[PDB]
């Protein structure tokens, strides 16, 4: 039976772009507002895995910052220990790979990014080898469409953002999220405009972008609640578990977190403190094995799953849809309009998002692969 | 895309102030539990449109027609037409049928289990893969086995039945605390100085103790090296079990009588076990794996129960256990497993203190023709 | 010295998107993924002593009733025959023990104990010439306040009209199901509270399918209209969720209809997760019902029994047990079940002017009519 | 149906200097003791002439108890149906609860009335009390030897020996009586009686948690059955700490009055065994405590004390109906002399109580007894 023969990693850089916030000599800028670094152009790391019989699997992970660090991990360590393995042992292979370095504490960050790209490609292969979509190897397909929500409203002013939203509503979308930092007029007002414009039927959530104390977050949420708030995301710092638990206990709005996590181990202490109502796994950080472990833990603990979505060619997005098709508790899924649209030329397969819903790809494996054009754009490590 | 077409249920009977009654049931004065005089289980045969067949099995010791009725009157119709690659999702749908009325354990889940195992059996045949390869990977093809019990009337006779099993490769054992007529310290003391400081020896305490009673028995065993202590208190006595777990340095093991991962949650939350012992015949592959995944997340070891059966749910257990990270050992019913080799075709085996995980597609085992002829339809 | 002689089990059937029943009469409501028969059906048990005294029990028979009758006929019956009905609670414990170590501690198994248990108490009452409640510590009341269990109409307004009609007949306590509140629970509470006035009590049955935070939000939206209790806010196994809801809302949380034994209650109470317990006699039997009522008493929890489809036998047992409990406030009443089934019983169990009349005679004070017995289908 | 017609109450007397009233204080435990044993009895008669008997403590100021019965409770009981016995208990408890009369003499007084009404109930139905409590589970009840009233360790060991030879295999000694330390006491008794018997210790309250834990750790090597009353009744924190700090079972309850007393202790996991005293509690409370124990997998080992035998009879009936009854205390010193005061088959021999067989309590005061009653 077929075994992994070779593994290659590449970056894929895209022409889509991100006062005193100019990129540095390496193409990185920092937003003074949040002290977070951003690259100038979209970019992700892809991994190509081929078996002895010539089957090919594709995986993908973040590559926004120092992507050659991730590729070095794949190339220097993981590749040589994955060659020879059976892709049907994907989750066990994942655990083996994770154990290589766990006792030295490389149990997140770049290390799990690397693991994810490999994990996704092995699962892609398993599906192809068996002639099944990945969700049929994950316990079954529960749905073939997944509701999508508009990830944000990147406009200059409140008025404009609200119109942008109404445009999307016209296309069949009835769930939306805005980021609190962009709310120049304040969250209460943003919420007011959106509710007014869009009506009482739509769901409206707010991503608070982490930088608040528990008390600051509570005040902001309370100010939004009168206008019908779907959920509040990332109200406090990642490390501030006590803060997160206080916030969830203090407001009646569902609290959502998780996009910056890496493994199910990250979820456990937040559930222990009943600090979240919704988990938001980002497939590109986690890989299928962990993303499923988080979704299953959410099932046991009665937490809703609303996966994150981000900059990427569509490979880990495809994995996110497959895994999401197989999870009991997946309600809805983030949708990045300005990323999904332009990236269409990069993919072959029938993945789509239209009329407020994702279409889960149907072919074996992920159901999608990089187009000939995409494969030409790839730059090998 | 192949689909479930028909489902049939059967019983299969195997011969082994407490006389059996009209219907062959007796009650041990010792533990107030009911027993059949004849061992019996419930099998399920599932066939798809294209003619693939899957087999499942659950308990049938008592009122097995009740379980077959659940299967035949309710579950069958909601399974027929489904894709067996959706086994887990099908499990959740069937469980939801009756959950709001509180049918979330006992006979209802026994019924779900037999169907679940059959469906997974089909998924593997259709993919031409062992079930463990549909459960995230095969992590082992052998699973260490421990000797379930030593049924003899004397502390000395028991110490022998054991030594013999030891002479056959086995190096882990368990004894039942009620069987120890001389006291459990005697039992431990003897077994230890008769099998060496090598083997692992555990005690199944059979539920009937208060926390403080159980702590006393355990401390009297601990000097002799106690591998684990199973079922030290009543199933309902979660506080009791938490107190026991915290008061002794011995691993506490529970789980054979549960049905779903939901049963495990409250016990993990009280740090009330170090080992979970799922019984596949009660749970099915879907629940078994969920319990094993939960154990993995919570750093709990997995030592699956084994029991009276044809070998169908046992084969399921072995497949699930090959795919679990935290499976250390697996119980071995020597008295049962032994004479049932004539009921199965496939390469499932146990020797030299280890189970061999069956290799074929699906569970890797099926009832022989001779076994199917013994089946009594519902 | 009269002992149990024989035991028989029967069913009793009664008329009433892609949800068409299948060839076995079962449909699944897409909304809640739950199965329903297209026909009321319960399981009855008839127990007779050496001396010819007869007692009746009843329990759920909505789905696979044969399974429950099989547990009674194959297992439980032989171990009851020969025993003294005045040992009903002792007997229940013995039968529970037969299978407890294998985990048959709820579901169909306890349904089976319940029918047997109720018939035995019926007998002990008949044999003593006393109402069941005079064997349960004493009668404390002979009338039990009743509340309207549901409002089966398809608009908010038609549902308010329905409640007002019941108000006209002397009812002053009501409950609606959140899944039917097409306008939302807030709007539902508003029209009910406006149509019926400031004095009526209005509860919401939330029907399990919510996360704790979804539940808290729904409840907060209802509270400004004076919410009596919120029932089944989250999944049964979601005890963490249940505790968090109770701790986050000022409204009384009610649970219990789907439990089986007092053991089910302990962990919820230990988490302070309920203000009201709602035992269902048809699932529990009198022994378990009363142990739950007494646990409630010690823990200052109100008891508001559930009511459901049935012949009226387990209902009667519910009224007897209720008449003996300190903490019984009111009792659920389903007209739709109750009125039709009047033909099926001899005795004085009634419900009018917002109150259950507790049956007078010995035992349960009721028994199936000739007509009913003529409809029984033996297992 | 028959109804309560009248109620009367009486004392019955039986046989560090006592004061002019019969009371002495033991420097040891600061507790007061009468010189003559004494209890309070109540006699209840129906319209139709049925008669029930009940009893409670009368050791100290028995007139206070009888006064509560006579002045308050009697008039609110006359007219009620005895089959409502438990409902009547709650009604009576409620007369005074808001003023905080929820234990002590008040509940003593309720207990005597409760016991009499249950008697009437059984009699009226022609049933032993246990058949009105949900069934009889047993007719014999393992008994254990309450104490070893000897001035020397060697002598006590022997007295236990005599008892072992008459069929008893469970024993308890009081830690204060142990002149050479509780460790030496356990050791000798364990050697004299072998490794089979159960030996418990009643520590008589007067210890801090840490004192108690040290004493118990000293005893444990010698096979300790349970430790009773290790700290003050009000010291629930201390009780919890004791239970959590030793592996031995902790036993309490003899001085409680109601099931509400038990809840706070169970909540702190502070006990493995409850020791209800029928004389303080009555059948209603006794049974409620017994059921609460059942739910929480706690053992029930009822206490026994100086008495006529009426509340002892109630205790056996109740215990015959309890699921969790392990054994029952045995006061040989009281029980044997007192036999002449009772009519019925209540017995204790070969290490077992025989539960009375007749209807109601199955026992009633002898003609000699009734002659000796002093009315209130
Ligand atoms: Cl890193
Ligand atoms: Cl069941
Ligand atoms: Cl007082
Ligand atoms: Mg975010
Ligand atoms: Mg076991
Ligand atoms: Mg309800
Ligand atoms: Mg004492």
PDB file of C-alpha atoms in Angstrom, chain B residues 21 23 25 27 32-35 59 61-63 65-66 69-70 72-74 77-78 92-93 95-103 106-108 110 207 234 236 257 259 262 282, chain C residues 22 24 26 28 33-36 60 62-64 66-67 70-71 73-75 78-79 93-94 96-104 107-109 111 208 235 237 258 260 263 283:
ATOM      1  CA  UNK B  21     -35.772 -19.504  37.733  1.00  0.00           C
ATOM      2  CA  UNK B  23     -36.410 -18.162  32.568  1.00  0.00           C
ATOM      3  CA  UNK B  25     -32.028 -16.119  35.722  1.00  0.00           C
ATOM      4  CA  UNK B  27     -29.375 -13.646  41.713  1.00  0.00           C
ATOM      5  CA  UNK B  32     -27.768  -8.730  44.392  1.00  0.00           C
ATOM      6  CA  UNK B  33     -27.047  -8.865  40.644  1.00  0.00           C
ATOM      7  CA  UNK B  34     -28.930 -11.029  38.145  1.00  0.00           C
ATOM      8  CA  UNK B  35     -27.208 -13.613  35.927  1.00  0.00           C
ATOM      9  CA  UNK B  59     -24.895  -7.400  25.198  1.00  0.00           C
ATOM     10  CA  UNK B  61     -27.397 -11.390  28.819  1.00  0.00           C
ATOM     11  CA  UNK B  62     -30.812 -10.174  30.024  1.00  0.00           C
ATOM     12  CA  UNK B  63     -34.055  -9.454  28.133  1.00  0.00           C
ATOM     13  CA  UNK B  65     -35.563  -9.091  22.909  1.00  0.00           C
ATOM     14  CA  UNK B  66     -35.918  -5.558  24.376  1.00  0.00           C
ATOM     15  CA  UNK B  69     -37.031  -4.415  19.535  1.00  0.00           C
ATOM     16  CA  UNK B  70     -35.340  -1.043  19.926  1.00  0.00           C
ATOM     17  CA  UNK B  72     -36.147  -3.351  14.846  1.00  0.00           C
ATOM     18  CA  UNK B  73     -39.035  -1.065  15.798  1.00  0.00           C
ATOM     19  CA  UNK B  74     -37.127   2.226  15.927  1.00  0.00           C
ATOM     20  CA  UNK B  77     -35.825   2.595   9.615  1.00  0.00           C
ATOM     21  CA  UNK B  78     -33.692   5.646  10.334  1.00  0.00           C
ATOM     22  CA  UNK B  92     -25.527  11.188  16.682  1.00  0.00           C
ATOM     23  CA  UNK B  93     -28.821  11.273  14.720  1.00  0.00           C
ATOM     24  CA  UNK B  95     -29.012   9.137  19.748  1.00  0.00           C
ATOM     25  CA  UNK B  96     -30.941  12.355  19.277  1.00  0.00           C
ATOM     26  CA  UNK B  97     -34.198  10.483  18.507  1.00  0.00           C
ATOM     27  CA  UNK B  98     -34.897   9.809  22.130  1.00  0.00           C
ATOM     28  CA  UNK B  99     -32.488  11.900  24.186  1.00  0.00           C
ATOM     29  CA  UNK B 100     -35.037  14.532  25.330  1.00  0.00           C
ATOM     30  CA  UNK B 101     -36.980  11.726  27.018  1.00  0.00           C
ATOM     31  CA  UNK B 102     -33.946  10.457  28.888  1.00  0.00           C
ATOM     32  CA  UNK B 103     -33.161   7.262  26.902  1.00  0.00           C
ATOM     33  CA  UNK B 106     -28.900   1.321  29.198  1.00  0.00           C
ATOM     34  CA  UNK B 107     -30.679  -0.685  26.506  1.00  0.00           C
ATOM     35  CA  UNK B 108     -30.939   2.249  24.084  1.00  0.00           C
ATOM     36  CA  UNK B 110     -26.602  -1.077  23.632  1.00  0.00           C
ATOM     37  CA  UNK B 207     -18.727  -1.353  43.422  1.00  0.00           C
ATOM     38  CA  UNK B 234     -21.130   2.703  43.540  1.00  0.00           C
ATOM     39  CA  UNK B 236     -23.641   6.980  41.374  1.00  0.00           C
ATOM     40  CA  UNK B 257     -20.867   0.140  32.842  1.00  0.00           C
ATOM     41  CA  UNK B 259     -22.460   4.211  27.712  1.00  0.00           C
ATOM     42  CA  UNK B 262     -21.074  12.149  28.656  1.00  0.00           C
ATOM     43  CA  UNK B 282     -21.998  -1.276  25.551  1.00  0.00           C
TER      44      UNK B 282
ATOM     45  CA  UNK C  22     -42.818   5.566   8.308  1.00  0.00           C
ATOM     46  CA  UNK C  24     -44.017   1.865  11.879  1.00  0.00           C
ATOM     47  CA  UNK C  26     -42.839   7.161  13.644  1.00  0.00           C
ATOM     48  CA  UNK C  28     -39.005  12.867  13.212  1.00  0.00           C
ATOM     49  CA  UNK C  33     -34.570  15.770  15.649  1.00  0.00           C
ATOM     50  CA  UNK C  34     -36.869  13.929  18.065  1.00  0.00           C
ATOM     51  CA  UNK C  35     -39.048  10.905  17.107  1.00  0.00           C
ATOM     52  CA  UNK C  36     -42.844  10.869  17.622  1.00  0.00           C
ATOM     53  CA  UNK C  60     -44.370   5.422  28.798  1.00  0.00           C
ATOM     54  CA  UNK C  62     -44.601   5.971  22.948  1.00  0.00           C
ATOM     55  CA  UNK C  63     -41.735   4.125  21.306  1.00  0.00           C
ATOM     56  CA  UNK C  64     -40.754   0.451  21.257  1.00  0.00           C
ATOM     57  CA  UNK C  66     -42.581  -4.009  23.514  1.00  0.00           C
ATOM     58  CA  UNK C  67     -39.043  -3.496  24.807  1.00  0.00           C
ATOM     59  CA  UNK C  70     -40.166  -7.475  27.628  1.00  0.00           C
ATOM     60  CA  UNK C  71     -38.079  -6.205  30.569  1.00  0.00           C
ATOM     61  CA  UNK C  73     -42.154 -10.024  31.426  1.00  0.00           C
ATOM     62  CA  UNK C  74     -38.681 -11.549  30.990  1.00  0.00           C
ATOM     63  CA  UNK C  75     -36.881 -10.152  34.036  1.00  0.00           C
ATOM     64  CA  UNK C  78     -40.480 -13.448  38.269  1.00  0.00           C
ATOM     65  CA  UNK C  79     -38.595 -11.484  40.911  1.00  0.00           C
ATOM     66  CA  UNK C  93     -34.607  -1.235  45.333  1.00  0.00           C
ATOM     67  CA  UNK C  94     -34.169  -4.991  44.867  1.00  0.00           C
ATOM     68  CA  UNK C  96     -33.059  -1.757  40.595  1.00  0.00           C
ATOM     69  CA  UNK C  97     -30.091  -3.696  41.981  1.00  0.00           C
ATOM     70  CA  UNK C  98     -30.486  -6.660  39.621  1.00  0.00           C
ATOM     71  CA  UNK C  99     -28.961  -4.706  36.787  1.00  0.00           C
ATOM     72  CA  UNK C 100     -27.328  -1.610  38.290  1.00  0.00           C
ATOM     73  CA  UNK C 101     -23.702  -2.790  37.960  1.00  0.00           C
ATOM     74  CA  UNK C 102     -24.144  -3.132  34.190  1.00  0.00           C
ATOM     75  CA  UNK C 103     -25.454   0.430  33.883  1.00  0.00           C
ATOM     76  CA  UNK C 104     -29.172  -0.220  33.279  1.00  0.00           C
ATOM     77  CA  UNK C 107     -34.206   4.670  30.210  1.00  0.00           C
ATOM     78  CA  UNK C 108     -36.541   1.760  29.532  1.00  0.00           C
ATOM     79  CA  UNK C 109     -35.327  -0.156  32.546  1.00  0.00           C
ATOM     80  CA  UNK C 111     -39.832   2.942  33.027  1.00  0.00           C
ATOM     81  CA  UNK C 208     -33.081  21.773  25.762  1.00  0.00           C
ATOM     82  CA  UNK C 235     -28.990  19.815  27.220  1.00  0.00           C
ATOM     83  CA  UNK C 237     -25.873  16.289  30.049  1.00  0.00           C
ATOM     84  CA  UNK C 258     -36.533  13.258  31.675  1.00  0.00           C
ATOM     85  CA  UNK C 260     -35.400   8.506  36.281  1.00  0.00           C
ATOM     86  CA  UNK C 263     -29.550   9.839  41.825  1.00  0.00           C
ATOM     87  CA  UNK C 283     -40.867   7.557  34.140  1.00  0.00           C
TER      88      UNK C 283
END
